[PDB]
Symmetry: D2
Subunit: 223 residues, 4 copies
Amino acid sequence: MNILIFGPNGSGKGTQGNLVKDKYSLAHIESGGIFREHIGGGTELGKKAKEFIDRGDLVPDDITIPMVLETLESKGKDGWLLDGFPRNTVQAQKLFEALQEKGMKINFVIEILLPREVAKNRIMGRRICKNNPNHPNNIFIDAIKPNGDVCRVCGGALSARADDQDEGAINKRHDIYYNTVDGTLAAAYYYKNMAAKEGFVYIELDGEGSIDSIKDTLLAQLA
Amino acid sequence: MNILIFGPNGSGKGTQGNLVKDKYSLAHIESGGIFREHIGGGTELGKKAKEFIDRGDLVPDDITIPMVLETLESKGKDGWLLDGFPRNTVQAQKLFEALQEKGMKINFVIEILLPREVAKNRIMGRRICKNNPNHPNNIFIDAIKPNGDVCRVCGGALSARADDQDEGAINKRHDIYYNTVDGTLAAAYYYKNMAAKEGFVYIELDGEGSIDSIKDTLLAQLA
Amino acid sequence: MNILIFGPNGSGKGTQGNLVKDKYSLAHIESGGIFREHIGGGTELGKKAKEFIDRGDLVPDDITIPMVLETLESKGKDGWLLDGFPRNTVQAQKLFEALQEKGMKINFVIEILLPREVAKNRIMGRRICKNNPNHPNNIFIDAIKPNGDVCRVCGGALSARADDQDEGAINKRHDIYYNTVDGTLAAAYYYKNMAAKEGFVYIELDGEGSIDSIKDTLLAQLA
Amino acid sequence: MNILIFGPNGSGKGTQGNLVKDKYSLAHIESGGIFREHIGGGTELGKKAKEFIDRGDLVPDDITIPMVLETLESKGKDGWLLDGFPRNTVQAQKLFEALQEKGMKINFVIEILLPREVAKNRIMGRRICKNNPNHPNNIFIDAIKPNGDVCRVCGGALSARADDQDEGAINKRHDIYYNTVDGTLAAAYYYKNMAAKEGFVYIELDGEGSIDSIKDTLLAQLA
Ligand SMILES: [Zn+2]
Ligand SMILES: [Zn+2]
Ligand SMILES: [Zn+2]
Ligand SMILES: [Zn+2]
């Protein structure tokens, strides 16, 4: 079972992917870990990639796509969940052609749907408990609203994290994710639009339902 | 059902208390919220307390204990869980005499047990995920160890929180908690030692078992 | 030369004290360091203090005042600057009587004056540069306003610190500082009111002028 | 007077540039602000750049170099200090040819020199004072070492910032800066090597001397 997952920052995408990967014993493959395996491990592709990174340039798609496929072959032989790549349409189509050339089949593509204003507010609304950072509090998510100014689980003090309040940075990542010309939504839709012809199932998850409700609908449509 | 809960920082005490209060529909009463009700709301006891606080002195026990009892009467009429008070033996005995004078019965006292070195390491070992602060990671808790330097749920970057690394502050709170002469353990033991005579049950939870395992044993011994 | 300095959080008090202590080769004695010398070093007074702290009670004034005087005798024999003690009128008068009993003379008392709303806004207005935390930026201090959303020195990204945004905590410290019944301003005024009789000079610094301008007027009135 | 400045993270580069720009009334032009002027202001080059950024690709040098020159013409007509661009040799040579085509002369190039291990330790050694974040403390810089665990200016508590402790991120920026094949040092040296032929002066600042000492030698060699 091979799955691609898409969703913006603010959509709970890591949480949902973790649940799927545990249930189906999948390798969870994330674009950052691919580079550490190849750039850090000095594979022939990684030594080639690292000459771009070390000038401040990006790695070209003709090196990145073979890296991804090498990792999928190596870590994903009993099934994989690919998270965070592709980000744009050129990458999505190069990835699809590379997977076909190696006979590697996509079985599911999952997209978590959330309006961009909702996604941004969910990130900025997070409040961290001083006593235990695991305690979920979010001023913009009714089911886990704080108890006034304090933690709804234990009554500890709450604070905001500066990176969650950095609106210029949140907006530049959502700019790319929500770009339906050639950004990540256009990439997700390129897969949606060929699912029926290519024999895979495209699953749309409504990101506004609860952690439990989303997990139920998802684990039902893969089962 | 009236319950007192004790445990050091690093023992998961808020999490466990929240579970108990939800299961039994208890008011969760924490020492900080008592002051906001009385100091903030200008009760006669609160206006009296606030003259000490405003000089930098502590509120005397002859004002704090009546505050606690007024809150228990007011917010806790259908059952309460009192968390974070008493902290020492003088408070514990004044509280017991005040509860007897008002005919308010203790039904359970819960103590979460953890060695102090274990408690400190659990606090300092916490690592927060950049992508989602809910994702539990802890270098000192094997079941939720990170995946190398990254989040074990989603592969996001991890960082430490400065307050979790502040060893002088952690040690001064554990100094008080673990003081068996007249600190919080001596207070917990004052209750343990009269449980049989006073007709309440003293529950000891081994804080090194999992969130699930502790919750099972606890919810079993209250049931 | 012996000096007491008073000022609220938000008044630049540490900066000014450091300048005075360097110019006059004074020991800078701060209430926190007194405890580490005595509580940490197990002086007879410190072992006595630590039994209160370890129950969660404050150290009584009849132990704290002798501690302060022992430190002044020991670290301050060639002149001292005492910062952060006394905080209330009872401490201020006990300190004055203890200094007289040991023949230790006050030469100057410095008070940095700022309206409380100004002090709070100066704390909340601080913005820290990502590239270098030394670069001063403050949305509420015109001379060091940021350059739009970025550092006015180097153009780096700016963020806020959670403790600078914690209005409940800022307000509880200003509650004590600005309490003119028996809090820290009442303590400062107790000294002001006896300066002429006791042969010391009381210096009032207008905390709204620049770091340079305040330093000039101050170093002039001590010279 | 037109100046290019180079230095790694950890070298005090913003501080020194600010001093030069104030003394000579220069526009301080930093690579981040160029994009906000063009990408944010929708110049014809900026609308072109933003189509790459919105796919997650970099802006090509044939768009970035004209952007830089347009900003230099517009904001830098009475003299500029260009900070943070170029980062590699291809950019450095394209920039030089673009400046020649517009008749814009370089007068000085400043390089702040520090060994990479020294630069990393200066970043990781920073400690921020709780009372005032302006107070410089650094465990790796002897002149501003803390006073034990506390602020050397005011005795306040010290903490570390997570981004200053992120060694993978520090190393990836130093990887590019210290790359003498085609990274930022190779770019700086491309200018050094033509200074005499092109009639500009290349200034090397020893980054291990004090803020004052560096500023003196620098302001002397520009004067
Ligand atoms: Zn909490
Ligand atoms: Zn995570
Ligand atoms: Zn800066
Ligand atoms: Zn300081």
